[PDB]
């Protein structure tokens, strides 16, 4: 409700930015700026690895941020449309649910703690398959499926 | 004249590429949430 | 005179011995530098 915020270029909302632990993040192919004034004025770095950029969060804004984990047994997760399944190393939606334009949503864990940000996903007849950021010990990683399609 | 010039450029550029190598190495640890770097790197190699 | 000139190649043993050292070193340090990025360049790529 209030971690997430909007990205507006030219009057247009093109994706979403997530504050989460001690960085700002955003996909980095998404153009456009930031709403929120203070947040504009950082400088990022970026990163054509892993379509990521990041920042340091300033101080006064720390009350707000979310918490994180690193645990991913299988199970059943949460996101803004609905229930979205976990098994075999995949991200399951039931087909339809999504259209491009919605990049740069958290996925939730059964308390709420945020463990991936999904950026596209592939077509297939019944479900479908995403394409996600997800973290570990020290690390980063990208989970790309074949035929995947940005959002 | 022009063998001292040419050394020069040599120098330059051994010096151009270990910069290089400093940013690839480092750059995936700045980007988790909550992680930290280890000590060898963090002072030693890629610092 | 009764005796040829002389050419580039025709230099002094000491001289020659001084132009050894010095570029021998340069050559060092530029083959350190390049094996860095070879190693560190490799393990990136294969480690996604």
Same mark, same amino acid.
């Given at each position: 409700?209030?971690?997430?915020?909007?990205?507006?270029?030219?009057?247009?909302?093109?994706?979403?930015?997530?504050?989460?632990?001690?960085?700002?993040?955003?996909?980095?192919?998404?153009?456009?700026?930031?709403?929120?004034?203070?947040?504009?004025?950082?400088?990022?770095?970026?990163?054509?690895?892993?379509?990521?950029?990041?920042?340091?969060?300033?101080?006064?804004?720390?009350?707000?941020?979310?918490?994180?984990?690193?645990?991913?047994?299988?199970?059943?997760?949460?996101?803004?449309?609905?229930?979205?399944?976990?098994?075999?190393?995949?991200?399951?939606?039931?087909?339809?649910?999504?259209?491009?334009?919605?990049?740069?949503?958290?996925?939730?864990?059964?308390?709420?703690?945020?463990?991936?940000?999904?950026?596209?996903?592939?077509?297939?007849?019944?479900?479908?398959?995403?394409?996600?950021?997800?973290?570990?010990?020290?690390?980063?990683?990208?989970?790309?499926?074949?035929?995947?399609?940005?959002? | 004249?022009?063998?001292?010039?040419?050394?020069?450029?040599?120098?330059?550029?051994?010096?151009?590429?270990?910069?290089?190598?400093?940013?690839?190495?480092?750059?995936?640890?700045?980007?988790?949430?909550?992680?930290?770097?280890?000590?060898?790197?963090?002072?030693?190699?890629?610092? | 005179?009764?005796?040829? $000139?002389? %050419? =580039?190649?025709? !230099?002094?043993?000491? &001289?020659?011995?001084?132009?050894?050292?010095? $570029?021998? %070193? =340069?050559?060092? !340090?530029?083959?350190? &530098?390049?094996?860095?990025?070879?190693?560190?360049?490799?393990?990136?790529?294969?480690?996604?």
């Amino acid at each position: 409700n209030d971690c997430i915020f909007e990205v507006k270029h030219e009057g247009k909302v093109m994706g979403y930015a997530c504050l989460v632990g001690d960085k700002v993040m955003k996909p980095a192919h998404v153009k456009g700026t930031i709403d929120n004034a203070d947040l504009a004025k950082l400088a990022f770095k970026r990163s054509s690895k892993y379509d990521l950029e990041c920042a340091q969060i300033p101080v006064h804004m720390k009350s707000d941020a979310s918490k994180f984990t690193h645990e991913k047994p299988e199970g059943y997760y949460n996101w803004h449309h609905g229930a979205v399944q976990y098994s075999g190393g995949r991200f399951t939606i039931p087909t339809g649910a999504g259209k491009p334009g919605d990049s740069g949503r958290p996925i939730f864990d059964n308390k709420g703690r945020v463990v991936a940000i999904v950026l596209g996903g592939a077509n297939e007849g019944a479900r479908t398959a995403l394409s996600v950021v997800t973290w570990n010990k020290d690390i980063v990683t990208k989970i790309t499926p074949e035929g995947a399609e940005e959002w | 004249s022009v063998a001292s010039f040419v050394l020069l450029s040599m120098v330059g550029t051994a010096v151009g590429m270990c910069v290089c190598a400093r940013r690839r190495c480092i750059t995936p640890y700045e980007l988790t949430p909550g992680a930290t770097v280890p000590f060898l790197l963090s002072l030693l190699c890629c610092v | 005179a009764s005796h040829t $000139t002389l %050419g =580039v190649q025709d !230099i002094s043993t000491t &001289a020659m011995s001084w132009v050894q050292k010095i $570029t021998g %070193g =340069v050559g060092l !340090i530029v083959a350190v &530098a390049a094996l860095i990025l070879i190693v560190v360049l490799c393990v990136s790529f294969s480690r996604h």
